[PDB]
């Protein structure tokens, strides 16, 4: 309850989809994504998080060649730690708009999670979680 002392006591990790045993293979992970036009892209900032077992570096292009993923903001960087990086490549001939997820999972990037996919750089699936811990509790749980 009333355990908030100072602003950065609150933490935001994005737990990856591998926990629920959701297939992160280079064949089934593309089944949870789709396209839509008419919605705005949005960003959300998170402090720390789990490193993913498998990460994706996908640059989808239209038949013309332009990357359907949005231009990354300057504060958007590569994902810190990944055991496996999958360079899945391919095209979508009919879809339009911006890339969106189906299940509701966010695309996790360097300390900023997003509702869309950015141009040609490493990300992972996940959902960010909010909680309140101080340094005494966090010390005995961090390691």
């Amino acid at each position: 309850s009333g355990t908030l002392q100072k602003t950065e006591d609150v933490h935001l990790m994005g737990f990856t989809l591998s926990g629920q045993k959701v297939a992160d293979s280079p064949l089934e992970a593309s089944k949870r994504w789709a396209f839509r036009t008419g919605v705005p892209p949005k960003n959300v900032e998170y402090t720390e998080g789990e490193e993913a077992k498998t990460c994706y570096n996908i640059s989808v292009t239209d038949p013309s060649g332009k990357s359907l993923l949005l231009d990354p903001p300057s504060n958007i960087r590569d994902y810190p730690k990944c055991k496996t990086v999958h360079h899945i490549q391919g095209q979508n001939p009919h879809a339009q708009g911006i890339a969106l997820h189906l299940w509701g999972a966010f695309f996790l990037y360097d300390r900023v999670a997003s509702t869309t996919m950015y141009r040609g750089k490493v990300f992972t699936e996940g959902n960010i979680a909010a909680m309140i811990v101080n340094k005494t509790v966090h010390r005995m749980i961090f390691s």
């Binding site: 602003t7 609150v10 509701g104 996940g126 811990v133 005494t136 749980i141 961090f142």
Partner: protein, 100 residues
């Protein structure tokens, strides 16, 4: 977006794999200067969260609980830059704490 509070005393909570390998922002004496800092590459520190009393398991389930409301929240805002919910939670926590 619900927000629990894991605090010791009893490792109880308030308001799934055991291998939780995370990275965190690190928390002689000249390091606070940006010229003598560690950089953004080396800022990340390795860590390991143990699930001794259902701590990971109660947090992985929370992940898709928060995906419901957070998606609606980002829909309303007309600002497409990075949105800090850090103050949002703190202000909301103060508002909902005062009762009666």
């Amino acid at each position: 977006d619900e927000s629990p509070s894991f605090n010791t005393s009893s490792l109880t909570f308030s308001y799934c794999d055991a291998e939780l390998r995370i990275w965190s922002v690190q928390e002689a004496g000249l390091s606070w200067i940006p010229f003598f800092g560690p950089g953004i590459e080396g800022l990340y520190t390795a860590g390991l969260i143990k699930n001794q009393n259902n701590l990971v398991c109660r947090l992985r389930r929370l992940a898709n609980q928060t995906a419901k409301s957070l998606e609606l929240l980002l829909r309303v805002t007309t600002e497409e830059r990075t949105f800090s919910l850090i103050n949002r939670i703190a202000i909301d926590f103060l508002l909902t704490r005062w009762g009666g």
